[PDB]
Amino acid sequence: EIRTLTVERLLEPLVTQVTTLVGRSKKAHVLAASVEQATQNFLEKGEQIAKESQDLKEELVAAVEDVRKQGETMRIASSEFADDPCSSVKRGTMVRAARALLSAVTRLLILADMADVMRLLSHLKIVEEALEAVKNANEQDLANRFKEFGKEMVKLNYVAARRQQELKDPHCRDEMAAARGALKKNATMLYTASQAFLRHPDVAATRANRDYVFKQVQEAIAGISSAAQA
Amino acid sequence: DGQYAMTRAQRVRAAMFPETLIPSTQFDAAHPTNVQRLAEPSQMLKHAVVNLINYQ
């Protein structure tokens, strides 16, 4: 369940268009060095990004290892070619190694983007988990747990605002503002309900309303998500 | 999937082949995305390859 193939296919025309070809050479060896340097620089960012990423770590690391391997093959081919730029065979072995390298790069970007989107959607879970703390909290905790929520919510308000402006369909714009508006009110109703349970721990309905209101919080988080991934 | 999968091609395409030209996936403005962080070292690599491949 990864399916990077379909995106990889769409970009393949671009990779192939740019890898089209429109004694020992010294000026060819510096170009070769440049590529090796560019390879190492790209490898350095990909390792950093695969490390910090909270999603697809093992997949992303594999993607960088693939890029490295293709880099070495490209390195070796470009070194052989620079030794004698007259040969078409070593020219072609380099060009093919290059096309393979950039395709491994392209696949890495595709994975990296898939993790960008999972990092983005995590905000929904972070806020939902923040309202679990509000629900499961003395009066001192409630005030505190509601401080954490509002902070996470503001960081969620940024994403959801950018997503609601990006919506083209007017009917979908309303859905986003509705679900995001629904989470806002029920979050406060959660605070009121959690408060009403501290003061009356033995009233079954206080617990029943708190559990209910939290379900209402679920429905908006999911509604915000469904309006985003559509 | 959804809108984020259907636009994945254009985001990658924009970062590696910007000259061949879209929802954002940035969670806060103080943190650039993986694709944004990888865009420039990706472009430099391709420019380096093009120069090499087209040596005369």
Short mmCIF file of C-alpha atoms in Angstrom, two decimals, chain A residues 58-178:
data_model
loop_
_atom_site.label_atom_id
_atom_site.label_comp_id
_atom_site.label_asym_id
_atom_site.label_seq_id
_atom_site.Cartn_x
_atom_site.Cartn_y
_atom_site.Cartn_z
CA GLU A 58 11.91 3.06 6.75
CA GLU A 59 10.49 3.74 3.29
CA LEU A 60 12.20 7.16 3.04
CA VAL A 61 15.54 5.74 4.18
CA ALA A 62 15.27 3.06 1.50
CA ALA A 63 14.56 5.85 -0.97
CA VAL A 64 17.78 7.64 -0.03
CA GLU A 65 19.79 4.41 -0.23
CA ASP A 66 18.43 3.91 -3.74
CA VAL A 67 19.42 7.50 -4.64
CA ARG A 68 22.92 6.91 -3.25
CA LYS A 69 23.36 3.66 -5.19
CA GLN A 70 22.27 5.35 -8.41
CA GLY A 71 24.63 8.19 -7.54
CA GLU A 72 27.62 5.86 -7.34
CA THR A 73 26.70 4.21 -10.64
CA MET A 74 26.46 7.69 -12.15
CA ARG A 75 29.75 8.66 -10.53
CA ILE A 76 31.57 5.66 -11.98
CA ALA A 77 30.03 6.10 -15.42
CA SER A 78 30.82 9.82 -15.56
CA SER A 79 34.41 9.18 -14.51
CA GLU A 80 34.90 6.61 -17.29
CA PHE A 81 33.34 9.01 -19.78
CA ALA A 82 35.47 11.99 -18.78
CA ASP A 83 38.55 9.83 -19.35
CA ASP A 84 37.61 9.78 -23.05
CA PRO A 85 34.60 11.89 -24.16
CA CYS A 86 34.86 10.53 -27.73
CA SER A 87 33.17 7.20 -27.03
CA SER A 88 29.44 6.89 -27.64
CA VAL A 89 29.21 3.75 -25.53
CA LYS A 90 30.48 5.42 -22.35
CA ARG A 91 28.46 8.51 -23.23
CA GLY A 92 25.35 6.33 -23.37
CA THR A 93 26.21 4.40 -20.22
CA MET A 94 26.46 7.74 -18.42
CA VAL A 95 23.23 9.13 -19.87
CA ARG A 96 21.33 6.01 -18.83
CA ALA A 97 22.92 6.16 -15.36
CA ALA A 98 21.83 9.79 -15.13
CA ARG A 99 18.25 9.00 -16.11
CA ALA A 100 18.21 6.31 -13.44
CA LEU A 101 19.62 8.70 -10.85
CA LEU A 102 17.04 11.42 -11.44
CA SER A 103 14.27 8.82 -11.39
CA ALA A 104 15.42 7.73 -7.94
CA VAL A 105 15.46 11.39 -6.92
CA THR A 106 11.96 11.83 -8.32
CA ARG A 107 10.71 8.82 -6.38
CA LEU A 108 12.24 10.23 -3.19
CA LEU A 109 10.38 13.51 -3.64
CA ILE A 110 7.13 11.60 -4.16
CA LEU A 111 7.61 9.75 -0.86
CA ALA A 112 8.67 12.96 0.89
CA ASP A 113 5.46 14.61 -0.30
CA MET A 114 3.41 11.66 1.00
CA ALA A 115 4.94 12.31 4.40
CA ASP A 116 4.27 16.06 4.14
CA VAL A 117 0.61 15.14 3.85
CA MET A 118 0.68 12.78 6.81
CA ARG A 119 2.45 15.39 8.93
CA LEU A 120 -0.28 17.80 7.88
CA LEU A 121 -3.17 15.49 8.77
CA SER A 122 -1.60 14.64 12.14
CA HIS A 123 -2.82 18.01 13.43
CA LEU A 124 -6.30 16.53 13.53
CA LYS A 125 -5.13 13.71 15.79
CA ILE A 126 -3.03 16.05 17.94
CA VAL A 127 -6.07 18.27 18.55
CA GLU A 128 -8.31 15.23 19.11
CA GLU A 129 -5.79 13.86 21.62
CA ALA A 130 -5.68 17.31 23.23
CA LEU A 131 -9.44 17.17 23.81
CA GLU A 132 -9.09 13.69 25.31
CA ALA A 133 -6.93 15.27 28.01
CA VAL A 134 -9.63 17.89 28.59
CA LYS A 135 -12.20 15.09 28.87
CA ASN A 136 -10.11 12.95 31.22
CA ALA A 137 -8.91 15.69 33.58
CA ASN A 138 -9.49 18.41 39.39
CA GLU A 139 -10.42 21.91 38.19
CA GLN A 140 -6.74 22.84 37.86
CA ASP A 141 -6.14 20.26 35.13
CA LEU A 142 -9.15 21.35 33.05
CA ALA A 143 -7.95 24.95 32.80
CA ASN A 144 -4.50 23.62 31.89
CA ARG A 145 -5.67 20.97 29.41
CA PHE A 146 -7.75 23.67 27.74
CA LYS A 147 -4.63 25.82 27.41
CA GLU A 148 -2.83 23.04 25.52
CA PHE A 149 -5.83 22.55 23.24
CA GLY A 150 -6.15 26.21 22.23
CA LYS A 151 -2.44 26.26 21.39
CA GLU A 152 -2.70 23.16 19.22
CA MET A 153 -5.98 24.47 17.82
CA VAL A 154 -4.35 27.73 16.71
CA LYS A 155 -1.70 25.68 14.94
CA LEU A 156 -4.60 23.74 13.40
CA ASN A 157 -6.43 26.96 12.53
CA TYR A 158 -3.51 27.88 10.26
CA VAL A 159 -3.74 24.69 8.20
CA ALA A 160 -7.53 24.62 8.03
CA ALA A 161 -7.64 28.28 6.99
CA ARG A 162 -5.18 27.71 4.14
CA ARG A 163 -7.18 24.67 3.07
CA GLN A 164 -10.54 26.45 3.17
CA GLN A 165 -9.23 29.24 0.93
CA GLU A 166 -7.85 26.65 -1.51
CA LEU A 167 -11.30 25.13 -1.96
CA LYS A 168 -12.79 25.87 -5.38
CA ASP A 169 -16.27 24.41 -4.94
CA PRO A 170 -18.46 26.86 -2.95
CA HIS A 171 -20.45 24.02 -1.38
CA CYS A 172 -17.19 22.55 -0.09
CA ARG A 173 -16.13 25.91 1.35
CA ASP A 174 -19.23 25.88 3.55
CA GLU A 175 -18.60 22.31 4.74
CA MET A 176 -15.11 23.27 5.93
CA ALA A 177 -16.30 26.31 7.87
CA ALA A 178 -19.13 24.20 9.30
#
